[PDB]
């Protein structure tokens, strides 16, 4: 994502700095998103949702 930097880096350019061919980098993004998906870790972020 683009937090605290002017991008928006993409998977190949990300995995360059981690030496992954973008597949493990996809997996790592997915794992972090799943971890933050948990309640008791994202109740505030839930409140930020508007609906």
């Amino acid at each position: 994502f683009g937090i605290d930097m002017n991008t928006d880096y993409t998977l190949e350019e990300v995995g360059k700095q981690f030496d992954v061919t973008r597949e493990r980098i996809r997996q790592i993004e997915a794992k972090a998103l799943r971890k933050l998906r948990h309640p008791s870790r994202s109740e505030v972020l839930r409140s930020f949702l508007d609906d």
């Binding site: 948990h38 309640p39 008791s40 870790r41």
Partner: protein, 73 residues
């Protein structure tokens, strides 16, 4: 307690502890607190570090062993 009926999802355990929980299928933390340490070591493939982490995750939210609930869930 309402959090005892919270599953092992909010427990925030490992993937291995999730393997063990699926192998046992203990849904609520209040049913699991009813069990003891050697009783948890009865489970296969779940070792000393596993029960150590389980005691840690129980000490996080005031959970522990020996609490025998009734009329649960």
């Amino acid at each position: 307690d309402p959090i005892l009926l919270r599953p092992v999802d909010d427990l925030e355990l490992t993937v291995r502890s999730a393997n063990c929980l699926k192998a046992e299928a203990i849904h609520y933390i209040g049913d699991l607190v009813q069990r003891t340490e050697v009783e948890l070591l009865k489970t296969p493939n779940l070792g000393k570090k596993s029960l150590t982490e389980i005691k840690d995750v129980l000490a996080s939210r005031g959970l522990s062993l020996g609490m025998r609930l009734e009329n649960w869930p």
